Amino acid sequence: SGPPGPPGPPGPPGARGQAGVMGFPGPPGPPGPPGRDATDQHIVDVALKMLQEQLAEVAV
Amino acid sequence: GSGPPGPPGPPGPPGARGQAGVMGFPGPPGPPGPPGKEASEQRIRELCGGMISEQIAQLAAHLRKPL
Amino acid sequence: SGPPGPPGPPGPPGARGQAGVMGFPGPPGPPGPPGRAPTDQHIKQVCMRVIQEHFAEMAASLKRPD
């Protein structure tokens, strides 16, 4: 004859949420170092060659 | 008299999605730049031909001068 | 003798997902700038230095004792 029962116990907790989204791609690396500057040696070698050539041409 | 408590409720909602991942590592440094091009012999000869010739001529005249 | 109760309330939300995986590594950097080539003026300056540095050899080739 009596009153209906209580609402039941709260349900079980839900499953774990899906893992987070992948992070942003890393930035491009820094630019490489500057190439070696051309040294003066290749100019010195030729200048010395010309000096010898022209000095010898005065000898003749 | 008074009723049994109802059956257990429905399962809860799935948890919130995880936080976004951390940014990836920066790339490696680029390759070194190409070496500076050397001047050709012809280019050097053209630029220094008259200079060397004038210097030799001036010196030759100076050393074979009479007082 | 009383009716059974209504079904309980919806349960807890689940625990939050684990953090996402780190992103892709970045691409390699660009190649460096080229080395510098000599200018016409620089070439002339070097040539004049060589003449000065070997002026002794030049004089000797043109004039010696006796």
Residue numbers in the entry:
A (entry chain B): 2 to 61
B (entry chain C): 1 to 67
C (entry chain A): 2 to 67
Q: What does the study report here?
A:
Two host-guest collagen peptides (GPP)4-(GXY)4-(GPP)3, where (GXY)4 sequences are from the α1 and α2 chains of human type I collagen, were recombinantly linked to chains A, B and C (corresponding to α1, α2 and α3 in collagen nomenclature and omitted here to avoid confusion) of the NC2 domain in the following combinations designated as α1Aα1Bα1C (for short 111), α1Aα1Bα2C (112), α1Aα2Bα1C (121), α2Aα1Bα1C (211) and α2Aα2Bα2C (222). Three unique chains form a parallel α-helical right-handed bundle.
Whereas the crystal packing for 111sm and 211sm are similar (two trimers per asymmetric unit), it differs from that for 121nat or 121sm (one trimer per asymmetric unit). The most deviated pair is the first trimer (chains A, B, C in the asymmetric unit) of 121sm versus the second trimer (chains D, E, F) of 111sm (r.m.s.d. of 3.01 Å). Crystal structures of 111, 121 and 211 constructs demonstrated that a staggering order can be manipulated at least for short native collagenous sequences, meaning that such sequences are rather adaptive to various abnormal conformations.
